Design an enzyme around this catalytic site. Structure first.
Site, mmCIF file in Angstrom:
data_model
loop_
_atom_site.group_PDB
_atom_site.id
_atom_site.type_symbol
_atom_site.label_atom_id
_atom_site.label_comp_id
_atom_site.label_asym_id
_atom_site.label_seq_id
_atom_site.Cartn_x
_atom_site.Cartn_y
_atom_site.Cartn_z
ATOM 1 N N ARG A 107 -28.182 -39.261 11.018
ATOM 2 C CA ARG A 107 -27.410 -40.406 11.493
ATOM 3 C C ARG A 107 -25.975 -40.349 10.995
ATOM 4 O O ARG A 107 -25.035 -40.610 11.755
ATOM 5 C CB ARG A 107 -28.072 -41.709 11.051
ATOM 6 C CG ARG A 107 -29.371 -42.021 11.764
ATOM 7 C CD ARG A 107 -29.942 -43.345 11.289
ATOM 8 N NE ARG A 107 -30.932 -43.181 10.233
ATOM 9 C CZ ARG A 107 -32.140 -42.664 10.407
ATOM 10 N NH1 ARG A 107 -32.548 -42.240 11.593
ATOM 11 N NH2 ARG A 107 -32.964 -42.576 9.368
ATOM 12 N N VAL A 108 -25.784 -40.009 9.729
ATOM 13 C CA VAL A 108 -24.459 -39.832 9.164
ATOM 14 C C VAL A 108 -24.294 -38.355 8.835
ATOM 15 O O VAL A 108 -25.266 -37.626 8.621
ATOM 16 C CB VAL A 108 -24.240 -40.716 7.916
ATOM 17 C CG1 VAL A 108 -25.163 -40.288 6.786
ATOM 18 C CG2 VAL A 108 -22.781 -40.722 7.486
#
Ligand SMILES: Nc1ncnc2c1ncn2[C@@H]1O[C@H](COP(=O)(O)OP(=O)(O)OP(=O)(O)O)[C@@H](O)[C@H]1O
Ligand SMILES: [Mg+2]
Lengths: 50, 493, 70, 468, 49, 466
Positions: free
Chosen positions: B354-355
């Site tokens: 996600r990051v």
């Protein structure tokens, strides 16, 4: 390589046995010396810490 | 007031009557007596009236009733500093490699609150694992919590070891925490790290299966305290101060099992799957300390790579879902891909970060976005792969290209690839420059290309490495240079 | 008085030496209830356990030396 | 006042107070802790001769028995008012941002307040447009009403929440409150900070209209337990003076889990899977305060984490009856690369009524559910035999269901960090028109792969024309 | 045999036994007071091995 | 010592000792039984002032509260040495065979030793050359590594155990230990005694080269829990001499079940599937002393019972967490007269990778797996449509797969008397080269026969010529 590993383990074991014997001999020497010097000499030193 | 006596030794817990002025997580000493030359420590946790339950950090058959205990005046802490580098230690900080006593000037208490929210910054600096698939499809940034979840023998430990090995010149302090792993596996891991020379910057904390359940429960916190010290204070690596660290917790499933054993031996109520109700708090307070601090708090980072072992590829269990919710991304290592020959088995369809997508070198993302798109097209066309001669030129070409890309993703163990080599190989693959190469020989083609670039064209690699930070990586100079290099390689081959 | 003591020394002392150990502890209560043991392993010091306090001065230096060399 | 600590069991501290000065049930007692900073505990029980059991809501791992505890005589008080706007607070109301502490002139309100009575309840609600196709079509985001999304561990609950905030927080027409009772301090916060400070409303950022109380996962169980109540007390001031409030509480399940851990340490008898016996009452006390009343309206949006993937878990089961619009995120849908991952069959809403949302919207939603209900009925038949054995109308409904399932996917502006697809904001009218056209028969010739991660039906048609 | 010979040589009182015991006594029990009062009987005699 | 029994609840007893000299955990207190015999209970907990909770490990039906209890001051003493060879012992170390007592001159070690330290572990993994073609080829052993076998005991598992013992005895130092955890008194004890005494190799019976520890079913859960530790204590003496030891544990799941029963009796809370909370720690106290050290190596081949064939079941899961090679004996393979009825597809091993066993071994093993997988896939096609419909360049693969599954048969040096065929020891390198030469095309003219109960490929060539 096998001979060196077996020798190294034996050498380390001998050092530990010698060090334990050396420490025991030093402890026995210290105990007799303190008794000759008087065990009632460090009692005051113990009281200082308390 | 610093001394007390044990009144009952049971399921790994002593009672330590009369030890007041003990703090709620003090490490009690159990001073040595006849038959026990060394001292085994304990964590005082249930500071009830006229009794202090203490978890025995070690075998509980060593102590008896009536043993003297002395409170050390410190909350449970692990020695930490530059002396820990290159040493394999117990969770308590004591060494187990036998090289010599650990040198340390300060100790950092384990079991501390994470720095917080304001004391953080979005990750920007990438982490080069050395695996083509991971570094191209699941970017990892410094301070990111990436989960390596698989099914038993699938390569999670191998992936973690490759990531540790690749951090040779990246200014990272790798930490490998072995929780519940058998001593043979830990020894093999340490030997592999030693052989490739990565042990010079790697701290290994070992809490093996034979060890008491008190250990395997504080081991990840000991490793995380070491990583926190690296992140905040920093250590000197290769003559430079590094405040970025990477920690691999290995099997967190075995850590949860050990904590469950500790809780059940304390007669705490069980929860889902017999785990205690605070197992999520356990792993969250363990993993939340892995942060990317902002500049005004030092600018350090601590990447975490927890490893979760599933049963029958059941990702919807309790502990795997807990860790997935805690972490930032997942790296699903499917067993079917691993058995099929794709040794770096990654379920790219569901693995994600996600990051860290923005925390990637611009060259890598600029070359790998279309890689991910083409892999998605191949996965979409997997259903139609069964039909023969019923597919047009476009679908057949897409299937062939997807097979080529998957074979390229297949990377042998213990062979990390530098970022320049990875981006060059992907640029070659994604520009229709490998359509003529047969699928079974793509691995050796990549190996020969890397050897050629190492021997014949070091300047191309250096230019790519220096120009990997540009906003528009495909500048005409690097494009023409690498195109000339690949044309020369193809002509020679 | 309210608390008791478990003072032990390196070697057996005399009756007068018992009184000195008793009167030297004027810090807490003056003259607390005490018990005395020899345990000849102790050398050159006292192990006073007053109230719930222990002070180690005997056999500690020799024991700590083993960890220094091993 | 001036008690002493008897036992320290986990984060639960049992203290003994004088006979005639025992603290009340919810009083906040403090340990000086030295260093000039004190640990604020909250009483939970009274056990007898001046003995009380309090929850530390702090580290409580470096303090001994016999430490003194000071009874403040009041429950935990938090600042309320315009001074809290644009600031970040703890469970205790202490700011954690770089700015200074709140002045003494700002009113302090106890975090334990009675929920609005039966008279004060406001049942008037209307659709709150959000731009998400599946949310605005199947389970309309209800204005002035409680709504929540239930997802597992891998599904994108945080992504959906962040996209919702990005879509609707700019045109707030009022202040807002964010409370991550339990969430990653990486994406739950310190990245919502950047998003909210980046967004600008006529030279005033969205963060200038927001009060943010976290109590992140790292925090001990007490902070996660009472951070929701702190956020509710901070938002009730704005609701009581008429301002429209958007309330985003993240992962109520973490509040439940903190309550469970606290109860386990408190010696209460466990219920069901290790949960506290007082689960329903705690959920009622927190949730009944999240109500739009006759004085002001709170547009709540919660998130719930299901342990493993069990929707029969006591915490989500308790949440389900406290909501107006329910959104269910499924693991299988997410694994099928449908990032919204909302299950239309398991997602409902109260305002999905023709008199409120519109007759055409209601008819479209009912048809989009009857389809995919036929698909769920024929799932096994398709899996074991294949599409051929179905009848012609059954076949057509099946591919229409698959096209609908693909079409519910929608790119999010907050998904640019790992997906290159630009975000789309599909108005509810466009969503209804697109799905009505798809159900009519238009788009049957288009292959299912063209509905993946698109906007309205016009975008799908344009993509089909581009690929000819 | 080589390890036995080296350890046998180290087993002598004056070789290491006297040196180690005296150094530890002069550093642990007291400071530069191994002899002090008496204690000459244990000098290289009590610490034979 | 000299405590008194305070409470007798089933097999769990509590003995009261003076405030000092309270026995430690795992201290094996002894209760006189009014005769030469005695009851040995292992202390598992210390409660209050001198009370210790112990597991009876015996009948505990004639005991009375207040009876004298003698503390041994150490865990269960087990006789070790060459005197143990060719003898059968229970968990306590008392011989249960017809021969007399071991005697006081023989060294006795605590049952609860410690796993070898971190430095003593071998950094590299070395293959264990068993000599059986299928075992050494498809699921190679690991020296100092655990191994699991799955079978219904009617598929010649005991014959495989006997062959392994004979091979290690004749080509290595060769001392084996058999741990009969929960082993039936009739089916698993006298039968194995007769098979081991009747089976002979170079004028030495298999029984004379191994020591068997039987924790029988009828013994209390403590005995079945600690019989494995007794077997390890016996094997570690020989491992300390540099010898290589095979430890055979029968149905390690019975050890897990005994641990679960002991935990339930002690009153501990039940883990997932009502297992002991200390499942990982109990499985780690065992199976961690089975390692390859600098001095010597202990390699174990342990039978595993999968509860309800549930592998996720935490008992087989924890067993698998400590395993290196799995061997799956199959009933269908044993129905045809192939004694080494090892299922090649189900049997895997961790050490079967290029970095250890070499590139050629990995390549030939993978090719054998591929061709056998193709044969398994085409079984249904052959059964339904027949041989004719299957196309070319695949009928060759089917024929090669049939010949290669008949090739896994191997004469056993322990079964030469029953079958009248001398046993053959096939080296791992010889196995690899023979199977590579079978795969590349040689021997295609040879029919399925002449591969049955044969050794190397040169042997089958000679048989074909004659
Ligand atoms: N990229 C790879 N290429 C080839 N072999 C690999 C690769 N990764 C792993 N392996 C092999 O897979 C096996 C297991 O790998 P590894 O030691 O990483 O275990 P794991 O899957 O992480 O889990 P476990 O610790 O439970 O065994 C080993 O034989 C190893 O050599
Ligand atoms: Mg692994």
């Amino acid at each position: 390589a096998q001979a060196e590993q077996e020798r190294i383990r034996m050498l380390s074991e001998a050092k530990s046995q010698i060090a334990d014997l050396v420490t025991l001999t030093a402890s026995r020497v210290l105990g007799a010396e303190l008794q000759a010097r008087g065990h009632d000499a460090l009692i005051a030193e113990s009281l200082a810490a308390l | 007031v610093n001394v007390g006596t044990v009144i009952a030794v049971g399921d790994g817990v002593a009672r330590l009557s009369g030890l007041d002025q003990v703090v709620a997580s003090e490490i009690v000493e159990f001073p040595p007596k006849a038959g026990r030359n060394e001292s085994i420590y304990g964590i005082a946790l249930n500071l009830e009236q006229d009794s202090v339950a203490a978890i025995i950090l070690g075998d509980d058959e060593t102590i008896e009733e009536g043993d003297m205990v002395t409170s050390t005046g410190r909350v449970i802490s692990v020695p930490v500093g530059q002396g820990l580098l290159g040493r394999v230690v117990n969770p308590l900080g004591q060494p187990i490699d036998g090289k010599g006593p650990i040198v340390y000037e300060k100790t950092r208490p384990i079991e501390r609150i994470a720095p917080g929210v304001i004391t953080r910054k979005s990750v920007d600096t990438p982490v080069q694992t050395g695996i083509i698939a991971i570094d191209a499809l699941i970017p990892i940034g410094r301070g990111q919590r990436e989960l390596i979840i698989g099914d038993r023998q699938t390569g999670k430990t191998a992936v973690a070891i490759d990531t540790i090995l690749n951090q040779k010149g990246q200014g990272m302090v790798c930490i490998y925490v072995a929780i519940g792993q058998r001593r043979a596996q830990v020894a093999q891991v340490v030997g592999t790290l030693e052989r490739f020379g990565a042990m010079e910057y790697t701290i290994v904390v070992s809490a093996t299966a034979s060890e008491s359940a008190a250990l395997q429960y504080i081991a990840p916190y000991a490793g995380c305290a070491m990583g926190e010290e690296i992140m905040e204070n920093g250590v000197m690596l290769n003559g430079q101060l590094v405040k970025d660290a990477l920690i691999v917790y290995d099997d967190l499933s075995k850590h949860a099992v050990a904590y469950r054993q500790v809780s059940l031996l304390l007669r705490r109520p069980p929860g889902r799957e017999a785990y205690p109700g605070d197992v999520f708090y356990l792993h969250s307070r363990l993993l939340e300390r892995a942060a990317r601090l902002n500049e005004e708090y030092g600018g350090g980072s601590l990447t975490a790579l927890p490893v979760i072992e599933t049963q029958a590829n059941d990702v919807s269990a309790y502990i795997p879902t807990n860790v997935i919710s805690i972490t930032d991304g997942q790296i699903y290592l499917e067993s079917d891909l691993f058995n099929a020959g794709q040794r770096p088995a990654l379920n790219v369809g569901i693995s994600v970060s996600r990051v860290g997508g923005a925390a990637q070198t611009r060259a890598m993302r600029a070359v790998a976005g279309k890689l991910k798109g083409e892999l998605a097209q191949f996965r979409d066309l997997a259903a139609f792969a069964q039909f023969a001669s019923d597919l047009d030129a476009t679908t057949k070409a897409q299937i062939e290209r997807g097979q080529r890309l998957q074979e390229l993703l297949k990377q042998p163990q213990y062979q990390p690839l530098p970022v320049e080599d990875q981006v060059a190989v992907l640029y070659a693959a994604t520009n229709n420059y490998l359509d003529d190469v047969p699928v079974p020989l793509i691995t050796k083609w990549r190996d020969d290309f890397l050897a050629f670039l190492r021997t014949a064209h070091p300047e191309v690699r250096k230019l790519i490495y220096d120009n990997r930070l540009d906003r528009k990586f495909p500048t005409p100079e690097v494009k023409e240079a690498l195109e000339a290099a690949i044309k020369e390689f193809k002509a020679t081959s | 008085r309210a608390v008791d003591a478990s003072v032990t020394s390196a070697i057996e002392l005399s009756a007068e030496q018992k009184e000195r150990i008793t009167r030297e502890l004027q810090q807490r209560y003056g003259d607390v209830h005490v018990t005395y043991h020899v345990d000849p392993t102790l050398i050159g010091g006292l192990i006073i356990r007053v109230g719930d306090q222990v002070l180690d001065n005997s056999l500690r230096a020799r024991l700590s030396a083993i960890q220094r060399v091993l | 006042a001036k008690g002493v600590i008897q036992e320290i069991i986990g984060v639960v501290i049992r203290a003994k107070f004088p006979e005639d000065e025992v603290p009340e049930i919810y009083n906040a007692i403090e340990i000086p802790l030295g260093n000039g900073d004190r640990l604020v505990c909250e009483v939970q029980q009274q056990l007898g001769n001046g003995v009380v059991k309090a929850v530390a809501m702090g580290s409580t791992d470096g303090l001994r028995r016999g430490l003194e505890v000071i009874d403040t005589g009041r429950p935990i008080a938090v600042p309320v008012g315009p001074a809290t706007l644009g600031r970040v607070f703890n469970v205790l109301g202490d700011p954690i941002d770089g700015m200074g502490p709140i002045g003494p002139e700002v009113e302090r309100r106890p975090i334990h307040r009675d929920p609005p009575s039966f008279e004060e309840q406001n049942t008037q609600a209307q659709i709150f447009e959000t731009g998400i196709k599946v949310i605005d079509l199947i389970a309309p985001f209800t204005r002035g009403g409680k709504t929540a999304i239930f997802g597992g561990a891998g599904v994108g609950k945080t992504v959906v929440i962040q996209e919702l905030i990005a879509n609707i927080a700019k045109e707030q027409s009022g202040f807002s409150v964010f409370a991550g009772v339990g969430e990653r301090s990486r994406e739950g916060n310190d990245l919502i900070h950047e998003m909210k400070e980046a967004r600008i409303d006529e030279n005033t950022t969205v963060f200038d209209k927001t009060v943010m109380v976290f109590g992140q996962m790292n925090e001990p169980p007490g902070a996660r337990l009472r951070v929701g109540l702190t956020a509710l007390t901070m938002a009730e001031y704005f609701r009581d003076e008429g301002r429209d409030i958007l309330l985003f509480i993240d992962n109520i399940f973490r509040f439940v889990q903190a309550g469970s851990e606290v109860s386990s340490l408190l010696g209460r008898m466990p219920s069901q899977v290790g949960y506290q016996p007082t689960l329903g009452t705690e959920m009622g006390e927190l949730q009944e305060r999240i109500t739009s009343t006759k004085r002001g309206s709170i547009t709540s949006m919660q998130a719930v984490y299901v342990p493993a993937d069990d929707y029969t878990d006591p915490a989500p089961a308790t949440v389900f009856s406290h909501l107006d619009a329910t959104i269910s995120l499924e693991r299988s849908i997410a694994e099928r690369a449908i990032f919204p991952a909302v299950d239309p069959l398991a997602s409902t809403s109260r305002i999905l009524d023709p008199n409120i949302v519109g007759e055409e919207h209601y008819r479209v939603a009912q048809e989009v559910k009857r389809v995919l209900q036929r698909y769920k009925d024929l799932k096994d038949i398709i899996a074991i035999l294949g599409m051929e054995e179905l009848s012609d109308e059954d076949k057509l409904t099946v591919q229409r269901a698959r096209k609908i399932e693909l079409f519910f996917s929608q790119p999010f502006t907050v998904a640019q960090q790992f997906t290159g697809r630009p975000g789309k904001y599909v108005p509810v009218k466009k969503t209804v028109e697109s799905f009505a056209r798809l159900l009519n028969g238009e788009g049957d010739h288009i292959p299912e792969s063209f509905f993946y991660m698109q906007g309205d039906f016009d975008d799908v048609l344009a993509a089909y024309e581009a690929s000819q």
